[PDB]
Amino acid sequence: ASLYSLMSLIILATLVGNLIVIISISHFKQLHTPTNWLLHSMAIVDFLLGCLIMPCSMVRTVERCWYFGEILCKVHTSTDIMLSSASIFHLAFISIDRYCAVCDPLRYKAKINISTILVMILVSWSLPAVYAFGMIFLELNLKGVEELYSQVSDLGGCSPFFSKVSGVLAFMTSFYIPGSVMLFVYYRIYFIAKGQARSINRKAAKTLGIMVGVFLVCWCPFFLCTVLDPFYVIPPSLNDALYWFGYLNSALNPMVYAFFYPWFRRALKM
Ligand SMILES: [NH3+]C1CCCCC1
């Protein structure tokens, strides 16, 4: 229906959007710097996520029940968590790269060599993976809220249904730490980038605004709901609209960090 065709659009958009990043960057021997390796890796992560999770998840929400079979479920949701705890981390390390240009600008190249960038890619793909799988594979969403998951007998649907202290921990680490680093950085860049045009006069707001705005509107609603419910009036059907918000964010990530800019456009429009 409306939902079906519409959600397929998003998945395809993600796939075609990111293969572009990866084709342009790997073989051009004009783009061999430390920064691009991040937009490459984010492309990769969003790609994998898109293709495997999205279509499985897309089957699930045009229905009330998961019927794939339960041995599969746990694998699946952990993959969803891992791949996105990856996307948010990627945005934060890009922030540090950008902070480091517009502050210590005499030392930048030395500090951001390809070795640093390598650590930044391994950490991004390691800690999300591990944590998601370890948590959901040792019966650790529910420890104390076991019966409910009533919520999985009749409902039998893969919902990350979190326990009381589960919501606080998961929400905190992935939204609160990655969210805060970003805000500090962009705040300072507003004051410096706008302060300079004082001197040269005798743009910043649009760019920085559009980056932070996207992230927040796409994630704040799903995550706020999540920490709250262990304190359970929320409904099942409405709760779903929030997952898909995260997935939509993933597409627009390529447009915001690798196409708004002229170098990409010119090289791609060769
Ligand atoms: N959709 C999921 C992504 C992060 C973990 C909990 C929600």
Structure tokens of 115?
Answer: 């070795």
Ligand 1 centroid, distance to 79 Cα (angstroms): 10
Sign of CA dihedral 168, 173, 174, 180: positive
- Domains of the chain plus CATH, in order, are 2-268 (1.20.1070.10)
Structural method: cryo-EM
Cβ neighbours for 223, distance < 8 A, ≥ 6 positions apart: 171, 174, 175
- Rounded to whole angstroms, the Cα distance separating 129 from 81 reads 8
Identify which of 222, 224, 242 to mutate to test ligand 1's pocket (most ligand atoms within 8 A of the CB).
Answer: 222
Residues with their C more than 2.5 Å from the N of the next written residue in the chain, i.e. before a break, are: 149, 202, 231
Q: What is the CA radius of gyration of the chain?
A: 20
Q: Which residue has the CA at smallest separation from atom 7 of ligand 1?
A: 81
Enter the resolution in angstroms: 3.0
CB neighbours of residue 25 within 10 Å:
18
> Which amino acid does the sequence have at 246?
G
Nearest to 226 by CA among 129, 92, 60, 81: 81
Ligand 1 centroid, distance to 81 Cα (angstroms): 5
What single-letter DSSP state applies at residue 161?
-
Nearest to 72 by CA among 49, 48, 56, 61: 56
- Residue showing tokens 């994630």: 219
- Rounded to whole angstroms, the Cα distance separating 222 from 231 reads 15
C-beta of 81 in contact with ligand 1 (< 6 A):
yes
**Structural contact between residues 218 and 248, judged by C-beta atoms closer than 8 angstroms:** yes
For residue 132, give the ligand 1 atom closest to its CA: 5
The torsion defined by the Cα of 196, 198, 199 and 201, in degrees rounded to 10, comes to 120
Nearest to 205 by CA among 217, 215, 218, 193: 193
Runs of H (alpha helix) within the chain: 2-27, 36-61, 70-99, 108-111, 114-137, 164-171, 177-201, 204-228, 236-258, 262-268
Q: Which residue has the CA at smallest separation from atom 1 of ligand 1?
A: 243
For residue 243, give the ligand 1 atom closest to its CA: 1
- Rounded to whole angstroms, the Cα distance separating 121 from 111 reads 16
- Rounded to whole angstroms, the Cα distance separating 230 from 162 reads 7
- Rounded to whole angstroms, the Cα distance separating 98 from 104 reads 10
Report the interhelical angle of 114-137 vs 70-99 (nearest 10°).
150
- Rounded to whole angstroms, the Cα distance separating 117 from 237 reads 41
**Structural contact between residues 77 and 158, judged by C-beta atoms closer than 8 angstroms:** yes
For residue 222, give the ligand 1 atom closest to its CA: 7
C-beta of 84 in contact with ligand 1 (< 6 A):
yes
Nearest to 249 by CA among 22, 120, 90, 63: 90
Nearest to 60 by CA among 163, 162, 156: 156
Nearest to 166 by CA among 76, 70, 77, 67: 77
- Residue showing tokens 């104390």: 144
- Residue showing tokens 């937009």: 39
What single-letter DSSP state applies at residue 153?
T
- Rounded to whole angstroms, the Cα distance separating 219 from 63 reads 23
